[PDB]
């Protein structure tokens, strides 16, 4: 009819916005966790270098 189509369009705009936000948040999580794990690896290498210096 008439109002039904507009209501469906609203329900679809919500769909697109929610899905896009979810995808963007997932990408953010991937990037942040990669950052953290690379920092942890750098910390490990520093520990090993400290061990060599102690030797």
């Amino acid at each position: 009819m008439d109002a039904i189509k507009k209501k469906m369009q609203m329900l679809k705009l919500d769909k697109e916005n929610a899905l896009d936000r979810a995808e963007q948040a997932e990408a953010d999580k991937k990037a942040a966790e990669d950052r953290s794990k690379q920092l942890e690896d750098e910390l490990v290498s520093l520990q090993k270098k400290l061990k060599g210096t102690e030797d």
């Binding site: 009819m1 039904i4 189509k5 469906m8 679809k12």
Partner: protein, 56 residues
């Protein structure tokens, strides 16, 4: 002669009446055509909404 006049008058009235009835049935047939167009359009719009929603 009198009977002929009477019969001719009744036949003329009958012709006029059938003309009126044929015009009336034409009008009502046209109205039914319009309503059939209405149902065709509303079913088409419902199908369009259905295909849009199923196809996003």
């Amino acid at each position: 002669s009198d009977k002929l006049k009477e019969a001719e008058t009744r036949a003329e009235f009958a012709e006029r009446s059938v003309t009126k009835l044929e015009k009336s049935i034409d009008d009502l047939e046209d109205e039914l055509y319009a309503q059939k167009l209405k149902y065709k359009a509303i079913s088409e719009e419902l199908d369009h909404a259905l295909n849009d929603m199923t196809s996003i």
